Amino acid sequence: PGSEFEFAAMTKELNACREQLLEKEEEISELKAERNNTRLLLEHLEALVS
Amino acid sequence: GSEFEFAAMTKELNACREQLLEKEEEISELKAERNNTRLLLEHLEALVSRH
């Protein structure tokens, strides 16, 4: 009864959490790619100034 | 409907929670690093645009 409600709540959260795992991993990759490009830009700027 | 199903689901949900937090913290740290370079570039842009 209450065991069913709670187990259903856990199953619901677990599914949502797993969906987010993929999404957040993708964002991490996006951020790392943006970071790498910014590093290159900053390197080019340093070269040009000095 | 196993006997140890509830305990198993509990452990699996906690594992996922921990994995998710780990990613969220890395995202926050990366955004912190991005904010640093972002402010730098905006500073550089302002100096040249002022010129």
Curated annotation (Swiss-Prot), chain A:
<comment type="subunit">
    <text>Forms homodimers and heterodimers with liprins-alpha and liprins-beta. Interacts with the second PTPase domain of PTPRD, PTPRF and PTPRS. Interacts with KIF1A; the interaction decreases in presence of calcium.</text>
</comment>
<comment type="function">
    <text>Alters PTPRF cellular localization and induces PTPRF clustering. May regulate the disassembly of focal adhesions. May localize receptor-like tyrosine phosphatases type 2A at specific sites on the plasma membrane, possibly regulating their interaction with the extracellular environment and their association with substrates. In neuronal cells, is a scaffolding protein in the dendritic spines which acts as immobile postsynaptic post able to recruit KIF1A-driven dense core vesicles to dendritic spines.</text>
</comment>
<comment type="similarity">
    <text>Belongs to the liprin family. Liprin-alpha subfamily.</text>
</comment>
<protein>
    <recommendedName>
        <fullName>Liprin-alpha-2</fullName>
    </recommendedName>
</protein>
